[PDB]
Amino acid sequence: DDLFGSASWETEEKMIKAKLITPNNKKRAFDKREVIVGRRGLGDFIAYAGQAFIGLIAPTRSGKGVGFIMPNMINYPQNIVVFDPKADTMETCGKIREKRFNQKVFIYEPFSLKTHRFNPFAYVDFGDFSTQIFGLAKLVFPERPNEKDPFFSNQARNLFVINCNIYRDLMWTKKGLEFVKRKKIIMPETPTMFFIGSMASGINLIDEDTNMEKVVSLMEFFGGEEDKSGDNLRVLSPATRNMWNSFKTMGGARETYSSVQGVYTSAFAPYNNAMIRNFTSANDFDFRRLRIDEVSIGVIANPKESTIVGPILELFFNVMIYSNLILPIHDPQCKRSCLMLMDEFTLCGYLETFVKAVGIMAEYNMRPAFVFQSKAQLENDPPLGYGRNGAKTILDNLSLNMYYGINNDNYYEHFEKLSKVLGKYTRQDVSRSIDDNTGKTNTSISNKERFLMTPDELMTMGDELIILENTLKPIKCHKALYYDDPFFTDELIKVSPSLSKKYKLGKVPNQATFYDDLQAAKTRGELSYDKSLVPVGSSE
Amino acid sequence: DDLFGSASWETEEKMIKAKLITPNNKKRAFDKREVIVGRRGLGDFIAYAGQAFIGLIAPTRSGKGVGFIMPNMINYPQNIVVFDPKADTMETCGKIREKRFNQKVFIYEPFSLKTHRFNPFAYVDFGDFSTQIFGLAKLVFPERKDPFFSNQARNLFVINCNIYRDLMWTKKGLEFVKRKKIIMPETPTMFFIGSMSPATRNMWNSFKTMGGARETYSSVQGVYTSAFAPYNNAMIRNFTSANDFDFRRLRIDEVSIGVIANPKESTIVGPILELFFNVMIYSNLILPIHDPQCKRSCLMLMDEFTLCGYLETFVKAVGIMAEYNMRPAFVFQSKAQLENDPPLGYGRNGAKTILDNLSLNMYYGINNDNYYEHFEKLSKVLGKYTRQDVSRSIDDNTGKTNTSISNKERFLMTPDELMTMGDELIILENTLKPIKCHKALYYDDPFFTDELIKVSPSLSKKYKLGKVPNQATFYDDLQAAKTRGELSYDKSLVPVGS
Amino acid sequence: DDLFGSASWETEEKMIKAKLITPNNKKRAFDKREVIVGRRGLGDFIAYAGQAFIGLIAPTRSGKGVGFIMPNMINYPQNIVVFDPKADTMETCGKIREKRFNQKVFIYEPFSLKTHRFNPFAYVDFDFSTQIFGLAKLVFPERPNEKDPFFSNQARNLFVINCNIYRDLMWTKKGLEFVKRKKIIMPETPTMFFIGSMASGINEKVVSLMEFFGGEEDKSGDNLRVLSPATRNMWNSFKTMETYSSVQGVYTSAFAPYNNAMIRNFTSANDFDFRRLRIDEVSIGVIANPKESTIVGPILELFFNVMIYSNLILPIHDPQCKRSCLMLMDEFTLCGYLETFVKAVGIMAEYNMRPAFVFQSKAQLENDPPLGYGRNGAKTILDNLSLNMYYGINNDNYYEHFEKLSKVLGKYTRQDVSRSIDDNTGKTNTSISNKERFLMTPDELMTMGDELIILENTLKPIKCHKALYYDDPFFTDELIKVSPSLSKKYKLGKVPNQATFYDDLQAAKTRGELSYDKSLVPVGSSE
Q: Given CB atoms, is C143 within the 8 Å cutoff of chain A?
């Protein structure tokens, strides 16, 4: 009966057709690169196949870690890139990623000497170049509408492009290399952000008269006082010469140049920090192989505690995503998937990269899962949010949304809307009339309406959750808790000697002690990635 | 009875009278330049005739391409201008456009050397002269705590173009330039104008008019350069390097125009697409009665419309474009994105102006809590009908039963029912009752897969014409054939720049 | 039947499973460091265990003290840091703490010479530059609400270089011998006033920063060599970037609150090391009000920023920090904008720093940073609250707040009776139907009186009674045991006289009977 609505939970047949489950789900092979998003029993999981992305609406301390991040970190067979702001996911699942899936683990922690390094210019072909340099400039000098005069930002972006072109002409051409050798110019074989920023003060060389280091401003070295014949200018390509002269006439002159250089140096200011400098000094893993090699990447950073890590991360993630925007059908060797467990998404602040990329990322097997506390934190101001439109474009590209329940008034309006989204169905209402004298009774049955789930029923769901897939009826299941299930605790105990000594395989671990013993074993490094392979650079 | 509402689906007879379907719909001729908007089954399509405009409210990944863009790309027999941001629509249907309908394919990719070029100065009559110049200046410097100066930069562009005009289309100016002092081209580009006789006497008076260059040249030149900066890019300079196709013949020749652009990835291409569409729309305000050559129609598949940003040309033109056979079909993610403020929207009243000119609206459904409000409204728009509600009573002693019938209201389609249509959709035509139908899936129908298999050798070996292709392998083989360019337009005629 | 709703109160079994109550609750041991949040009767309390934080939405004068602050002050056995602006909580429970839990009481009243002192430099080890840059960011707060951030935070580097030269000369015997030769005068340990005065230079004529370092008062440069030239290198970069005068001006304006003699005394020493807040058996009471004087604002921030950041060591990493510290944040919004709680409330739980934020309404937390925490900070604070107590008030200004609460509680299915009767015969007929009923209507919440609602994030709604301390022998016995004047009038174990207890309590409080040992807190003077 659909007189008062046709709301219902999705059927088994449709869930199977959507590849969410199999006819023998408890023994499913997990061969479709599926991400676990729920469960119906211990070992009976609902898992998302295909390429569509997942969103997780989970309030604070509601089990997003134990019910989504941890289980997929233990179970996902392809490559994973996980944001680990607390450095806890990797310290719990790195040994599993290494032993179970034979994957090399890379750790990116910009505020620690013990980190793998990322250098964006390692992904730029210096010997096309123009578009890569332009994209890097857009990342370093973002475009915004708040500014009253974007002239200075535009000119500093042009100055960045000019600096990159000058470096390419000086260190990646025969003429430029001979020029460098003649004038004794100091320049790296592969540039870094710190060096491109230092190029604002000018060229570094050795004075042939004093045999000491000297910096000559870009103004005087190229057509200026130290180039009265323009011979230093002729070393550059014609394009570089035109960019230089154009910058001079409309931004490199008068009151402008000093202010345009101030903006440039202020944009490169984050790299004065010794930690950020070391983090960007090299490139230990080629992101172009993120879908070729069997790897797992952990990003340990907190853009809220450290304001200067925001841009870095941006560059990072941008280079990480656009480096893999080549279809696998065009490169048959890029056959692996990369699950991007975007835990604590709102912690990243404004990352333009995802807002610009989510609409195309799917077909290239860069599969993120956005876990956040509420839509409000997503819609926030730039530095701590994404804006209304940014949050809207992020949410629009989320086909499977998991909704956790919590009994907090600060979420009522949320669970009300969700309740309305679940719709109503027709139920039977029984009434009874009684003759007070004779005792005879009459029983009437009528049709009434009822919400599939009321707001309070969602709010008190406990460890149950709702799943909304864009092409299916709503689903209600249980959280895929890892500690409750031998399916995950077996993998956790197999790689730890103390848990092996304490708990047996295949059996549900004693819940009064298993979490505390797991934390104790994690403290000793038993569940962590092999920390020896993480390089420790020094303050250079 | 209608006490609790009179809502109802439209009848087959009224749909026939509205020309959406024919008596023998499966054998319809498609001779009214119709746009397919839905299907009642394989080869049994609902198609919009006339000149009215189509709106498609399609959520993200709801199938707008496979259910609207691709079917009309394969079927529509007149001219087509399609927005192709992912570079997949043309790569999939260009061979059909060129082999089935015999149409020249023009690809405009501003961010690639391999592109056809568009120059607005190719649409001016160097020799109502200055009207085009002032409109072009309004496009170059948009009207908007910092007034003036930008108007002075617009005047700078005005007498800039006037200076280049006097420099060529004068008999003495030819010798003056033949003194070999400047290197002006024969026909100007936007980059050249940016880098730069009583009417010329007034132009000199303008050179000393408001004194915009007297102690204030720096800021005016800075704003002028901030406006002309898109043309410092090599890709943009190559895009404006020439004009390959004349938009004044968009309704004369048999052509298909694809535009590969993305202003959200780069806010630089915004003004170029603005100029592009302005000249394209404003090159065809000639009625076919006045110009008997402009007989063809131009269906504008505005896919990913909200990604284009604020194109005020559309806001001003939608109300008059219909009679000139410039027929757009707007596809936007949701209405909320359309009404947004100018930067990434059209404003509330501008979006309302655009939406008022849409007479057929297709509504896809997805189960997403972010689209609830919309769908709720849609539910209310469909109205309610009257339904019978049966109740029963029983005497628990004797066992006799009593059956009662009353009337209640029922939504024609509840919000969650709209959200869970799957491959079904709602059609609302201004003059018709609501319609429910199936998405015109192209990969499911031999009606379109026959055209896809015809022009490709690989699909011709694999699948037989007229038979529904093996759904387990058809899409993958289509992709494998697209990798070798069997379905793509012939790319050898796409010019390449330095 | 749940046709019209399934809302209900949480069952005894679940409250037992959530450690809120025990199978013999009246004889509960209180061994799980629990926090009382209500009662089912005299001596039968509901108590939150674990590490989750508490929020108390108690309207004005609805009894946050007698129903939450005072009973937990009496009952909670671990460490406590309480906010006591009226100086009444400490005055009533200090003797209780001292003589029942053997806990020493630390009182931080920055506007009374009778106070304990807090020195932020007592937590630095003479990771140097890290802590110095920290304290610099703590003093000069980075704010994105300014036309340029490159107008202020160079005073932070100025502070950093001043502390670096302090490490270079004052704590080094060679620098000390230079100091004795030139007769510069500095305390062995620095204070905020001093680092602020270092902008004036060497502290008898005071020379400034440019003449004493390679200027007119020192041309030979003998002073620049004794100090480690790393500070000179760090300062030579900022030397280039009317501007230096503005930087010194923002320096002096930031250090302005330390010119007041009371803030002088309050930051002159450090009686308690906040790193031992989870090792020792202590109880801290803060008596300050940022709303009547803005200058107290920053100090309190420094007081709390150091207090929690020094206790951010996991007990698994240092088992010595085994004690828990319940932070009774009574009158939370009085604290203005303290960036510490907004910036760290999301990570404190695992470190056994357990706050209970008490505020009258939600809309006031969202107030602008001057008076509130802003909407974002308020949202974060509320998001980190797992148990929320709701007191009632029959005041229309709160109606909306309770209406939402009513809706949050949901509805259940109730039986509805209808009666018909024949007028001639007189026989009757009774019909039963199902109807919806709010678990608690808005006006029912508003007229709750001494009852309250408890929303635990993982449980069903709970309705209970305020844990009144003057009502229960559980707390009045403890209060009497420490007071000679109260023991001769009321006996123990029995409920005392309600018409005479509060007055005698206030009389004994004025006699200092129930207060902490006041002779044990230091008294300063003018500096």
A: no
